[PDB]
Design a protein around this ligand. Structure first.
Ligand SMILES: O=C(O)CCC(=O)C(=O)O
Ligand code: NA
Lengths: 368, 368
């Protein structure tokens, strides 16, 4: 009865060897060939001109927002249903998160609720691509265009997804990714900013390397950060990136298994809706439990654990947690409902059909 | 003639082994054995109860200040002569750096200039142990206690140093260290906070880990950061620490060669003064050029370079660079003088007596 983990990394390419070179060469810091190579390759992978390697997906967002000039006073629209760093990133800038409702099916920012939230202080919108699925960008871009707003994609959970022929990371003014341990591709901890804007790219690199002038060593023209990725993180990321497609394929296999087995559950869960706008990379396989259940989402998590199956609740809405309770509105209903009923199911490259079978059997038993 | 670099990581212990283990077991993110082991060993090496591993020494500083509650309106006294991360860290809290001059001999915070800088807003004093030498702690602690201020040691360059029987890191309310690539101990990029106070340590672990309750996964009681160290960085760190005494001895030898051979340069340099307060670990061997010279400090660095020898200027005082020029005062004269004539010479564990001979001969050639 081996436990089943919601996530896990699969280092099945050149990771070990590339890490070895770093070690052998003594290039373990924030300078080395893999950083540039990883940035170049990631940039190509997304179809953009620039890729900026960061220490994590959280600092990437911060660094991206600061480079964009988000600061005190400014409002950034962010979905209440998201991972907390989306909101915190805005907060670190001294700026103000303005929460917006999501779609009840895709879990993503509802473009129809944006216009109403725009004010004289709005500067940007941060669509977050939940669970490997790109928000409906066209409408979002169109609203930003109309209001002269920046669009920053939090693409943390979406490496590889596409929207109407474009890869995540290539849609807003800039985008951020995470390579945290459980991500589609990992570096253990690591992040990336993508953009086509030369000027934003330069300011990002300037702020990443402590605010030091790249053309005047030891001289610091602005206040910056230490947000650099190491050559080792870059080594692991490059090797992961080389097998991105294989990694992508493995999740699709796992997802195909859930999808072929779901009737066993009936109307007891609603399977994740796939918008027909491009590839959904399924960082996580997310269901919405039946309101009709006597049991609670939280109990269900406890019961699956008891059956050695790991699962987690969908992100608690920002506005229901202490840091952002004050940002609550009466127009965050869908987010609340998903926060109530949402359940992330184990989705990782190493899960087997038998494991998926176990997961379904347990849900069948616990969904009461 | 290979080039002589000012610093360089000596990975001549178990770094490779420990790292390979992380790769082979897949533990390459911010959870794992090495993290806890490294924190454990480090806390013991410093003689304190807690050590909190972070992704760098700059975020370490930020994290510790936030944990001690530094925020908007507060003032922290920081020497103008330091690496800019010292001041930036306060800046990130939205607090105000209050610059103080240093000793002309040790390059450290001048305790005698502290009191007059204290105001109703002061919350803390940040002594920085430059070049591996601990500031004169007792007088500084004397002033702080009298004014009920916190003390936070920026111990980035002084792992291993001691002061009147105590290791760097055990002296203030908390302290920070850097394992950047050129540091006494390196993890490539890495940092650590040390403290004896249980609650400060807990709050520090709370913030480090995205502000998530260690007791209620997925729940976020406060706004935190992503400042965690990877298991890979901790693995390197632990292997470095296992050989800390050898690393320091190596530097001692090198320093000894300097002490002996520097005679050849006569009054053309002023050798680093060493306080008899405890061990000066010599992150860098720092001279101040003779006033009698006709050459300039920047020119000597260029001439050494052309001769294949790396050196660097003593840090530029904060108040003379754009970000902090607004905090300039007329009582920062020693820091300005040191910045003008200060030169860091190669100092690292891989240097031979011959290498040192070479640096001195080059200095004999360029100090005109
Ligand atoms: O780049 C950093 O984060 C620190 C730089 C530093 O300590 C140095 O160059 O001596
Ligand atoms: Na002179």
């Amino acid at each position: 009865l081996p436990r089943i983990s919601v996530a896990a990394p699969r280092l099945d390419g050149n990771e070990r060897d590339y890490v070895l070179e770093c070690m052998d060469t003594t290039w373990i810091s924030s300078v080395g060939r893999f950083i540039v190579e990883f940035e170049k390759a990631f940039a190509d992978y997304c179809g953009v001109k620039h890729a900026i390697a960061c220490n994590n997906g959280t600092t990437a967002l911060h660094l991206a927002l600061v480079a964009m000039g988000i600061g005190p006073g400014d409002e950034v629209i962010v979905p209440s249903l998201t991972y907390i760093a989306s909101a915190n990133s805005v907060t670190y800038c001294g700026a103000t998160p303005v929460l917006v409702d999501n779609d009840p099916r895709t879990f993503n920012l509802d473009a129809a609720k944006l216009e109403a939230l725009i004010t004289p202080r709005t500067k940007a919108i941060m669509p977050v691509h939940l669970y490997g699925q790109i928000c409906d960008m066209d409408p979002i871009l169109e609203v930003a265009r109309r209001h002269n707003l920046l669009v920053i994609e939090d693409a943390a959970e979406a490496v590889g997804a596409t929207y109407r022929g474009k890869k995540s990371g290539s849609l807003g003014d800039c985008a951020t990714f995470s390579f945290f341990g459980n991500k589609i591709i990992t570096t253990g901890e690591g992040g990336m900013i993508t953009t086509n804007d030369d000027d934003l790219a330069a300011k990002m690199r300037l702020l990443r390397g402590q605010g030091m002038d790249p053309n005047r060593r030891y001289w610091f023209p602005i206040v910056g950060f230490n947000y650099r990725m190491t050559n080792i993180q870059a080594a692991i990321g490059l090797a992961q990136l080389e097998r991105v497609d294989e990694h992508l394929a493995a999740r699709e296999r796992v997802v195909g298994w859930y999808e072929q087995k779901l009737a066993r559950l009936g109307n007891r869960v609603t399977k994740p809706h796939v918008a027909l706008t491009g590839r959904h990379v399924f960082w996580m396989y997310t269901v919405r439990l039946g309101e009709g259940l006597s049991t609670t989402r939280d109990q269900v998590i406890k019961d699956l654990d008891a059956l050695g199956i790991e699962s987690r609740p969908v992100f608690h809405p920002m506005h229901i947690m202490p840091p952002y309770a004050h940002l609550a509105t009466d127009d965050l209903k869908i987010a609340e409902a998903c926060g109530v009923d949402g359940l992330n199911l184990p989705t990782h490259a190493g899960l087997t059909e038998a494991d998926i079978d176990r997961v379904i059997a347990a849900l069948d038993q616990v969904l009461v």
